[PDB]
Write an enzyme that holds these catalytic residues in place. Structure first.
Site, mmCIF file in Angstrom:
data_model
loop_
_atom_site.group_PDB
_atom_site.id
_atom_site.type_symbol
_atom_site.label_atom_id
_atom_site.label_comp_id
_atom_site.label_asym_id
_atom_site.label_seq_id
_atom_site.Cartn_x
_atom_site.Cartn_y
_atom_site.Cartn_z
ATOM 1 N N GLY A 197 -99.032 -41.471 -62.671
ATOM 2 C CA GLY A 197 -97.608 -41.628 -61.395
ATOM 3 C C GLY A 197 -98.544 -41.430 -60.550
ATOM 4 O O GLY A 197 -98.973 -41.286 -60.118
ATOM 5 N N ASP A 222 -85.154 -40.314 -63.810
ATOM 6 C CA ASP A 222 -86.192 -41.143 -64.400
ATOM 7 C C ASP A 222 -86.837 -42.172 -65.734
ATOM 8 O O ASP A 222 -87.773 -41.737 -66.145
ATOM 9 C CB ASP A 222 -87.509 -40.543 -63.243
ATOM 10 C CG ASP A 222 -88.392 -41.560 -63.515
ATOM 11 O OD1 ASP A 222 -88.010 -42.511 -62.619
ATOM 12 O OD2 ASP A 222 -89.817 -41.421 -63.026
ATOM 13 N N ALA A 239 -92.588 -45.422 -69.227
ATOM 14 C CA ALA A 239 -93.506 -45.374 -68.931
ATOM 15 C C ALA A 239 -93.714 -43.061 -69.089
ATOM 16 O O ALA A 239 -94.130 -42.701 -69.880
ATOM 17 C CB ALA A 239 -94.494 -44.817 -67.488
ATOM 18 N N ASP A 250 -90.793 -36.352 -68.550
ATOM 19 C CA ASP A 250 -90.964 -35.827 -66.938
ATOM 20 C C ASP A 250 -90.118 -35.198 -66.805
ATOM 21 O O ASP A 250 -88.872 -36.523 -66.164
ATOM 22 C CB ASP A 250 -91.498 -37.324 -65.792
ATOM 23 C CG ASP A 250 -92.152 -36.838 -64.488
ATOM 24 O OD1 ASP A 250 -91.911 -36.239 -64.278
ATOM 25 O OD2 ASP A 250 -93.048 -38.280 -64.403
HETATM 26 C C1 LIG Z 1 -98.274 -39.028 -64.464
HETATM 27 C C2 LIG Z 1 -98.545 -40.265 -65.815
HETATM 28 C C3 LIG Z 1 -96.622 -40.263 -66.258
HETATM 29 C C4 LIG Z 1 -96.427 -38.715 -66.652
HETATM 30 F F1 LIG Z 1 -97.125 -37.700 -67.046
HETATM 31 C C5 LIG Z 1 -94.912 -38.734 -67.641
HETATM 32 O O1 LIG Z 1 -94.377 -38.116 -68.504
HETATM 33 N N1 LIG Z 1 -95.077 -40.667 -67.686
HETATM 34 C C6 LIG Z 1 -96.028 -40.936 -67.433
HETATM 35 C C7 LIG Z 1 -97.537 -41.584 -68.026
HETATM 36 O O2 LIG Z 1 -97.755 -40.631 -69.046
HETATM 37 C C8 LIG Z 1 -98.575 -40.843 -69.967
HETATM 38 N N2 LIG Z 1 -98.968 -42.103 -70.068
HETATM 39 C C9 LIG Z 1 -99.809 -41.827 -71.051
HETATM 40 C C10 LIG Z 1 -100.008 -41.052 -72.179
HETATM 41 C C11 LIG Z 1 -99.713 -39.785 -71.563
HETATM 42 C C12 LIG Z 1 -99.728 -38.797 -72.781
HETATM 43 C C13 LIG Z 1 -98.590 -37.771 -72.700
HETATM 44 C C14 LIG Z 1 -99.396 -36.685 -73.840
HETATM 45 N N3 LIG Z 1 -98.379 -35.390 -73.870
HETATM 46 O O3 LIG Z 1 -99.896 -36.389 -74.525
HETATM 47 C C15 LIG Z 1 -98.612 -37.477 -71.561
HETATM 48 O O4 LIG Z 1 -97.767 -36.307 -71.634
HETATM 49 C C16 LIG Z 1 -96.705 -36.141 -70.298
HETATM 50 C C17 LIG Z 1 -98.327 -38.329 -71.075
HETATM 51 C C18 LIG Z 1 -98.321 -39.782 -70.956
#
Ligand SMILES: CC[C@@H]1[C@H](F)C(=O)N[C@@H]1COc1nccc2cc(C(N)=O)c(OC)cc12
Length: 289
Positions: free
Chosen positions: A31, A147, A151, A165
């Protein structure tokens, strides 16, 4: 939360291997504020978010978002919020460590990223209910997420919805000079700098449209480019929700789809005071099933 050495997190993510998992790396997602990597700590699979200024913000603002996330996580524990296990602040970059979400994000599952099977209408109704339960817990605990988007809705081993997030979350109208959020999901008043839980409701309305249609909130190569514009097309009798229902399901019924669209439509009222509160959203989503 457990304090990790930056080097242990670097070690368990194969040196923060930025290549996606689908090609042999460790990247699960990314992100504007960082990259998420698959890791392995003490015989437990974990997710490690390495903080980075992807969408131009200061190192001080990135650190404030890091501190805010930990603070919100220490105060808010619920079935429908992702669980933070630890963090790292000693080395080269700030890291946040989470419980592994094997089904990734609702955004990625709706797009069937990496070839995952499409979500059934049954699964989608459970996800919408779970996400509303998580937002309800936040609003009951006087927190505004700021937010809400697909995603930021993660999916565990049972496809239970986990809101993620909390870097922009605020304890609670109020105005701000630093307008933050994802524009394709933002309430009109949020775009003008107002801080209100009523804005989370509007963004949740956009999420409900994504769940019904399987379409992303914005697509530059699509007409209309913004998903929220389909509400206008439907209201102006130009089209019907039937024309937009995701075709990648075989278990949807008109009644429950129309019931979810009605909830989405109420959430998307341009006037913040005409929107239902989160408790009414939960009630309507429970009645749908
Ligand atoms: C930087 C990406 C942002 C941010 F992290 C968010 O909260 N939403 C976005 C997408 O995030 C994720 N996308 C796919 C898979 C994801 C698995 C996990 C997880 N705990 O296994 C994850 O943890 C937080 C975030 C994941």
């Amino acid at each position: 939360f457990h304090s990790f050495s930056f080097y242990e997190l670097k070690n368990v993510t194969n040196n923060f291997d930025e290549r996606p998992i689908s090609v042999g790396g460790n990247k699960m997602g990314e992100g504007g504020f960082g990259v998420v990597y698959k890791g392995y700590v003490n015989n437990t699979t974990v997710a490690v978010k390495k903080l980075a200024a992807m969408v131009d913000i200061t190192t001080e603002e990135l650190k404030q978002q890091f501190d805010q996330e930990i603070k919100v996580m220490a105060k808010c524990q619920h079935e429908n919020l992702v669980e933070l296990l630890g963090f790292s602040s000693d080395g080269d970059d700030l890291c946040l460590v989470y419980v592994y979400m094997p089904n990734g994000s609702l955004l990625d599952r709706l797009s069937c990223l990496d070839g995952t099977p499409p979500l059934s209408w049954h699964m989608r109704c459970k996800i919408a209910q779970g996400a509303a339960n998580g937002i309800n817990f936040l609003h009951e605990n006087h927190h505004i997420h700021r937010d809400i988007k697909s995603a930021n809705i993660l999916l565990d081993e049972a496809f239970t919805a986990k809101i993620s997030d909390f870097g922009l979350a605020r304890a609670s109208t109020v105005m701000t000079s630093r307008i933050v959020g994802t524009t394709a999901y933002m309430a009109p008043e949020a775009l003008r700098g107002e801080i209100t839980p009523k804005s989370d409701i509007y963004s949740f309305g956009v999420v409900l449209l994504e769940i019904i249609t399987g379409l992303p909130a914005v697509d530059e190569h699509r007409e209309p480019q913004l998903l929220l514009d389909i509400k206008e097309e439907i209201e102006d009798e130009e089209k019907t929700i039937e024309d937009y229902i995701d075709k990648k399901m075989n278990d949807a019924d008109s009644t429950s789809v129309e019931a979810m669209y009605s909830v989405a439509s109420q959430c998307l009222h341009e006037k913040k005071n005409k929107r239902p509160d989160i408790k009414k959203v939960q009630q309507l989503l429970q009645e749908m099933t």
